[PDB]
Amino acid sequence: QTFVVSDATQPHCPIVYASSGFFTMTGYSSKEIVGRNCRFLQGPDTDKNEVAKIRDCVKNGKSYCGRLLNYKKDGTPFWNLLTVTPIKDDQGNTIKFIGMQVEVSKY
Amino acid sequence: ELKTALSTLQQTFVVSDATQPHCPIVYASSGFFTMTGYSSKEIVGRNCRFLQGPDTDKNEVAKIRDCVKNGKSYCGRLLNYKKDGTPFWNLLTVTPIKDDQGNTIKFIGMQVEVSKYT
Numbered sequence: 492q493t494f495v496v497s498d499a500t501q502p503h504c505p506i507v508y509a510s511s512g513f514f515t516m517t518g519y520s521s522k523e524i525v526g527r528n529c530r531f532l533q534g535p536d537t538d539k540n541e542v543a544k545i546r547d548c549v550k551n552g553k554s555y556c557g558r559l560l561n562y563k564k565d566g567t568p569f570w571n572l573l574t575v576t577p578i579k580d581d582q583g584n585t586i587k588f589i590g591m592q593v594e595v596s597k598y
Numbered sequence: 599e600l601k602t603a604l605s606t607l608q609q610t611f612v613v614s615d616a617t618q619p620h621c622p623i624v625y626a627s628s629g630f631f632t633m634t635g636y637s638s639k640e641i642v643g644r645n646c647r648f649l650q651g652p653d654t655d656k657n658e659v660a661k662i663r664d665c666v667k668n669g670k671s672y673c674g675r676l677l678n679y680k681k682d683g684t685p686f687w688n689l690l691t692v693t694p695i696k697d698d699q700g701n702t703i704k705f706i707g708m709q710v711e712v713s714k715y716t
């Protein structure tokens with residue numbers, strides 16, 4: 492599974508871990524993207540309503556599941572089957588999120 | 599590796615196989631025994647519904663069911679019970695894992711026992 496971990500205890504939820512498969516999928520290196528928000532995957536044709544749904548989920552520490560258009564480092568458009576799942580502490584605070592990505596195949 | 603990232607987060611989790619009838623647990627992390635009192639011998643190959651009991655909110659359970667059945671994500675809090683009967687609040691996520699055709703093939707469930715000071 493390709494995935495990233497973002498730290499919700501830091502402003503704007505920066506990536507703190509990218510799996511080897513994220514690099515394989517997107518072309519971006521772990522040194523290019525750690526410390527950054529995952530929004531860099533979006534581009535001209537990404538559905539902004541779907542982005543707004545993710546933003547709401549993230550802001551409220553709840554789970555997102557959906558499909559959105561993203562772009563690789565080289566500009567290649569792909570369909571990303573995405574989940575973003577809050578990780579909570581024992582007080583119910585959202586401390587991290589895990590985002591899991593699947594590139595929809597051509598067939 | 600996903601398992602490792604999770605362990606770095608000290609996160610209790612299970613994985614269920616949506617390709618098998620009734621979505622059985624195929625893997626449970628060591629924290630799942632610690633939290634629930636159930637061994638992997640008691641839990642692997644079963645559905646996680648065994649953690650529910652008399653006062654579990656059946657309307658919340660229904661929301662989980664409807665997410666699982668439709669390959670979507672659940673997030674919520676419900677009353678669960680340890681092997682010894684102890685009730686606990688379980689802050690639960692259930693997240694579909696999909697193949698490259700959009701088929702839900704597994705789920706990952708992440709549990710947090712709510713602290714006594716909350």
Ligand SMILES: Cc1cc2nc3c(=O)[nH]c(=O)nc-3n(C[C@H](O)[C@H](O)[C@H](O)COP(=O)(O)O)c2cc1C
Binds near residue numbers: 528533542571588592
């Ligand atoms: C852990 C995690 C993983 C994410 N992965 C993606 C991604 O794969 N693709 C994407 O377009 N957005 C992804 N996002 C969503 C963006 O980072 C951001 O939350 C979204 O663009 C909405 O907020 P904004 O409108 O302020 O950008 C992810 C978010 C989190 C927290």
Ligand SMILES: Cc1cc2nc3c(=O)[nH]c(=O)nc-3n(C[C@H](O)[C@H](O)[C@H](O)COP(=O)(O)O)c2cc1C
Binds near residue numbers: 612613662707
């Ligand atoms: C991966 C995964 C983890 C789950 N973890 C829990 C859990 O920790 N506690 C719980 O009560 N139910 C858990 N469930 C939900 C139940 O297994 C079941 O889906 C739910 O009770 C609704 O279906 P049912 O009405 O047929 O029982 C989990 C389900 C999945 C797929």
